[PDB]
């Protein structure tokens, strides 16, 4: 199946600026009749995709003049000449040249603002949860920008990947920041055996991780 | 004036069957293909196949052979998607889309399907408190093991201003978990009471949890 790769995964813009989004296919999208079946869609949260551009460069009726498409073969671009608030959302390319039709992973058009480090907070399991046999360690990473972040859990210095659950907010309307909650869920037995619990936050704003840690015995 | 209107949200258990509809208006239904597309929460769109609305012949993508059936009520300009022997991984929004000249030009609004073995289940609410500092302090509540969606976390504090975040729920092993944080001046906690009040209207359950050091 044809792989559709979009760049970038997130595009920060100021309202009124131009935006450009790229879609690259793993094979030519020229069909045997000479047509290129490459289309562009906008999807807003909780809504269906809306067609913008079809067959590379044809604007769908009802779509504002500020959207245009270009490209050929395996390399395609959607441009917005002057971005408006109604244009924020996720942009996807599709191909139907090859069966099965496939879609790009999406490019989120978001608001640009200055970079900001996360405020990182760690919390031990509650006595309530431990009574039920369970032990969640939680790390909030709040009000950071840009969205790209990596969180690593360690127990007694050793990386733990299993039983980690992460949840990311959408871009905040007040701040234009992002926030993330990361939860490491253990058994009470496991929690009460190990001693040191650490969440490590890798973000563009720091060359070394932000590290929050506690010792159970403390 | 072209529109595709889908049936409403579904909650089903593993092993059950579901039928989703897509009613077309504003064009001749039998002139154009109808396609089905899956969108699992935070996953890429996946094409499931199409039905020829004139012949009635369905074509299934390779991951949708076996438990998926496309059918028509041509008389009602309506297409149907049936999913049998439901799996947890069928949790997704399903879309119908018209195919005209190689383009998915009009989409249905989507039908949310949630698959879980869970009956209606209230959340457990766990306080998140710092535990052996700065000008502000962040507290939270972890809301775990509930079904179905709809919880709210409402914070009360001794602070005139606060900053709250609500973290979207995730489904794991048929139950949801979410969390919420509040940030207040350190002068207001622990000296004043902070509580999170967690409502789950579907189970008519409200839990108020006071945040202690």
């Amino acid at each position: 199946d044809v792989v559709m790769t979009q760049t970038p995964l997130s595009l920060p813009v100021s309202l009124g600026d131009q935006a450009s989004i790229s879609c690259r296919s793993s094979q030519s999208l020229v069909y045997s009749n000479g047509n290129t079946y490459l289309d562009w869609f906008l999807q807003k949260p909780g809504q269906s995709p809306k067609l913008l551009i079809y067959k590379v460069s044809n604007r769908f009726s009802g779509v504002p003049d500020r959207f245009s498409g270009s490209g050929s073969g395996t390399d395609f671009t959607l441009k917005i000449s002057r971005v408006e608030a109604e244009d924020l959302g996720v942009y996807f390319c599709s191909q139907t040249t090859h069966v099965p039709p496939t879609f790009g992973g999406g490019t989120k058009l978001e608001i640009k603002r200055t970079v900001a480090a996360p405020s990182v907070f760690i919390f031990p399991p509650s006595d309530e949860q431990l009574k039920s046999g369970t032990a969640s360690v939680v790390c909030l990473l709040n009000n950071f920008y840009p969205r790209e972040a990596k969180v690593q859990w360690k127990v007694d210095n050793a990386l733990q990947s299993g039983n980690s659950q992460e949840s990311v907010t959408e871009q905040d309307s007040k701040d234009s920041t992002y926030s993330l909650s990361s939860t490491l869920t253990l058994s009470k037995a496991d929690y009460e055996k190990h001693k040191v619990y650490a969440c490590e936050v890798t973000h563009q704003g720091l060359s070394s991780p932000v590290t929050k840690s506690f010792n159970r015995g403390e | 004036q072209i529109q595709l209107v889908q049936s409403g949200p579904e909650l089903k258990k593993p092993g059950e069957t579901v039928k989703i509809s897509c009613k077309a208006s504003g064009y001749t239904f039998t002139t154009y293909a109808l396609n089905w597309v899956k969108q699992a929460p935070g996953k890429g769109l996946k094409w499931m196949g199409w039905i020829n609305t004139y012949s009635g012949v369905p074509t299934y993508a390779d991951d949708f052979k076996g438990r998926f059936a496309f059918s028509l009520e041509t008389s009602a300009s309506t297409a149907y998607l049936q999913i049998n022997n439901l799996k947890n991984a069928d949790t997704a929004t399903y879309f119908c889309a018209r195919g005209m000249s190689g383009t998915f030009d009009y989409w249905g609004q989507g039908t949310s399907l949630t698959v879980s073995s869970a009956k209606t289940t209230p959340p457990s609410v766990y306080p998140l408190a710092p535990g052996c500092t700065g000008s502000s302090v962040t507290l939270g509540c972890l809301v775990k093991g509930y079904f179905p969606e709809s919880v709210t976390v409402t914070w009360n504090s001794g602070s005139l201003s606060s900053s709250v975040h609500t973290f979207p729920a995730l489904l794991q092993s048929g139950l949801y978990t979410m969390s919420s944080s509040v940030t207040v001046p350190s002068s207001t906690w622990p000296s004043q009471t902070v509580t999170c009040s967690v409502a789950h209207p579907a189970s008519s359950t409200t839990v108020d949890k006071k945040i202690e050091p």
Partner: peptide, 8 residues
């Protein structure tokens, strides 16, 4: 000519 077309 497109594989999803229903009528010539």
């Amino acid at each position: 000519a497109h594989w999803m077309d229903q009528h010539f």
